[PDB]
Design a protein around this ligand. Structure first.
Ligand SMILES: [Mg+2]
Ligand SMILES: [Mg+2]
Length: 230
DNA sequence: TTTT
């Protein structure tokens, strides 16, 4: 049946205040029936130190990665993580945005992303028939991409806790990570979603420990705290 | 809008 590509951006390095500093991973996934996991993945790491948190960088990074993965694997459709009711990105011009039911800042950021992303969605559509749709939180593949973003942020944490000495990572909404036998398994904590999961291989440098607990300043989000081999 |  329907094969979908989706992207999301989702690691977050935090300060001792538990407040975000920057995002870590952008991940595009290919999802087939039965839509609990990813057949294929593309990961692009950002620099969480010096990241734009207003949304412009994350959404732009998502569309470019997903289009890359989509051109290769040819899904039926791409799912973009922005809850705009499913309108196609190739149709998201400025007046179509100004007529949306969203916050003035929402319109301000999208219209600015529109300038370059909307023609980019149109070009890709003219040559593949593949829509990019702003479905956001009601898409299962987007949630899978989010879970993979979490997974690869754990992986990024583990492999960069040496440069740093301590690392505080905010995972995406209600998900956990487990690491056993050299691989990260991420799972949604939401039973309502139907058992979504992913995994990535990791190489854990001996001596490095980690711990998962709630973020006190962001209910429903978990902290992945990792201590350097000391 | 999106991030946690
Ligand atoms: Mg997102
Ligand atoms: Mg997300």
């Amino acid at each position: 049946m329907m094969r979908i590509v989706a992207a999301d951006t989702g690691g977050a390095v935090l300060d001792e205040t538990f407040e975000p500093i920057g995002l870590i991973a952008t991940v595009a996934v290919l999802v087939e029936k039965p839509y609990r996991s990813a057949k294929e993945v593309m990961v692009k790491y950002a620099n969480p130190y010096d990241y734009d948190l207003t949304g412009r960088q994350a959404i732009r990074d998502e569309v470019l990665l997903a289009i890359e993965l989509a051109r290769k694997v040819k899904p039926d459709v791409i799912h973009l993580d922005s809850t705009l009711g499913g309108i196609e990105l190739r149709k998201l011009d400025e007046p179509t945005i100004d007529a949306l039911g969203i916050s003035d800042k929402g319109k301000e950021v999208w219209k600015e992303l529109s300038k370059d992303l909307q023609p980019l969605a149109r070009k890709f559509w003219e040559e593949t028939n593949i829509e990019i749709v702003a479905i956001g939180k009601s898409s299962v593949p987007v949630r899978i991409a989010e879970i993979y973003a979490g997974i690869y942020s754990a992986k990024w944490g583990i492999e960069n806790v040496e440069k740093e000495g301590h690392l505080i990572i905010g995972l995406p909404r209600y998900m956990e990570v487990n690491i056993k036998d050299g691989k990260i398994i991420g799972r949604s904590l939401d039973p309502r979603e139907g058992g979504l999961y992913g995994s990535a291989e990791v190489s854990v440098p001996e001596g490095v420990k980690w711990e998962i607990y709630p973020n006190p300043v962001a209910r429903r989000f978990m902290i992945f705290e990792i201590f350097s081999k000391r």
